[PDB]
Amino acid sequence: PMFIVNTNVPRASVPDGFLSELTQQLAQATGKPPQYIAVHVVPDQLMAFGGSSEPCALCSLHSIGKIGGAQNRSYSKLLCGLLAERLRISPDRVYINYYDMNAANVGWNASTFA
Amino acid sequence: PMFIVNTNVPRASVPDGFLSELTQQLAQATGKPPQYIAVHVVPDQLMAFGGSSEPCALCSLHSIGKIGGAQNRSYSKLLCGLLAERLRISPDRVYINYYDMNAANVGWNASTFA
Amino acid sequence: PMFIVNTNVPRASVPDGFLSELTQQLAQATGKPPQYIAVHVVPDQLMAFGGSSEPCALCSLHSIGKIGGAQNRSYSKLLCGLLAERLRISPDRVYINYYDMNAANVGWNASTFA
């Protein structure tokens, strides 16, 4: 799985250990080994949510399976919790797009996962 | 809706008020309340379009509904118009990927829209 | 087609000519003329892959057709080869998400490709 967060929160506000925390919590939530979890945090962005430049985040979670109605609710609770606690971003200024990728449509190690 | 634009145009060339302009015009075009429109502008990027490093943009528009052939033509006319007028990017050096998101696959406010 | 590579490799490690090389090789691989190929390289990113911060890449390839099991294996071989040779990123620290876009869902030149 791959989780990306784009935010207007400044780099200095991203706590040390945040990538490791995301990695561990996503491993637990998706049930996948941490070795397969990739995380990417993009601070200092020029963004707005509802016209406002207050702290916000635009995010994505891609996984081969483990994506669905109830699972995405659970991911959203987890991830908005983490963004509120660690980055001080209000949950109602976060979007997370979820993508259930087909194994044949994910490249890795010079081939695909199919 | 969430609109991202990635461009090689420098930050200083992005006019003041551009994120608000995008927010307003996307609200009007998509018919969505502006409170739900998120925008993200990423200048100074290392990119090429057709092998050329002249001004270009790679963009995405995600929305829960309001995505389709005629609607996307209308969005493209609006958004290319804005990128040409404000960033001086030729319309034929813009790509916009359109995504019709399922409500169950968009997280917001510690839950999803399903 | 549009190819994006996000990486923690620093900008100074991206060799001169890399965007051109990507453009050429993707033209050859996808069979589409280089005038239609767009490329975007994003260095210096805050990212981890499998819990660590050695060189890695998170990538996407969007194309109107020319996406499928065997084709994506071929793309992954090419692209991981290039990222290893030029950026010294191990192939097993690369993910590439492949997207088969419908022509009506890609904007260009103030309209769509439909």
Curated annotation (Swiss-Prot), chains A, B, C:
What cellular-component terms does GO give this entry?
Answer: cell surface; cytoplasm; cytosol; extracellular exosome; extracellular region; extracellular space; ficolin-1-rich granule lumen; nucleoplasm
Species source reads Homo sapiens
Other known facts = Serum levels of MIF are elevated in patients with severe sepsis or septic shock. High levels of MIF are correlated with low survival. Drugs that inhibit tautomerase activity protect against death due to sepsis.
Stated family = Belongs to the MIF family.
Q: What is its main location?
A: secreted
Q: Does the keyword Zinc apply?
A: no
Q: Which disease is it linked to?
A: Rheumatoid arthritis systemic juvenile: An inflammatory articular disorder with systemic onset beginning before the age of 16. It represents a subgroup of juvenile arthritis associated with severe extraarticular features and occasionally fatal complications. During active phases of the disorder, patients display a typical daily spiking fever, an evanescent macular rash, lymphadenopathy, hepatosplenomegaly, serositis, myalgia and arthritis.
* Top-rank taxon: Eukaryota
Quote the function comment for this protein.
Pro-inflammatory cytokine involved in the innate immune response to bacterial pathogens. The expression of MIF at sites of inflammation suggests a role as mediator in regulating the function of macrophages in host defense. Counteracts the anti-inflammatory activity of glucocorticoids. Has phenylpyruvate tautomerase and dopachrome tautomerase activity (in vitro), but the physiological substrate is not known. It is not clear whether the tautomerase activity has any physiological relevance, and whether it is important for cytokine activity.
Sites bearing N6-succinyllysine, chain numbering: 77
Query: What are the BP-aspect GO terms?
Result: carboxylic acid metabolic process; cell surface receptor signaling pathway; cellular senescence; DNA damage response, signal transduction by p53 class mediator; inflammatory response; innate immune response; negative regulation of apoptotic process; negative regulation of cell migration
Q: Which residues carry this modification: N6-acetyllysine?
A: 77
Alphabetized InterPro entries for the sequence: Macrophage_inhib_fac, Macrophage_inhib_fac_CS, Tautomerase/MIF_sf
Which keywords are on file for this protein? Acetylation, Cytokine, Cytoplasm, Immunity, Inflammatory response, Innate immunity, Isomerase, Secreted
Q: What is the lineage of its organism?
A: Eukaryota, Metazoa, Chordata, Craniata, Vertebrata
Protein known as: Macrophage migration inhibitory factor
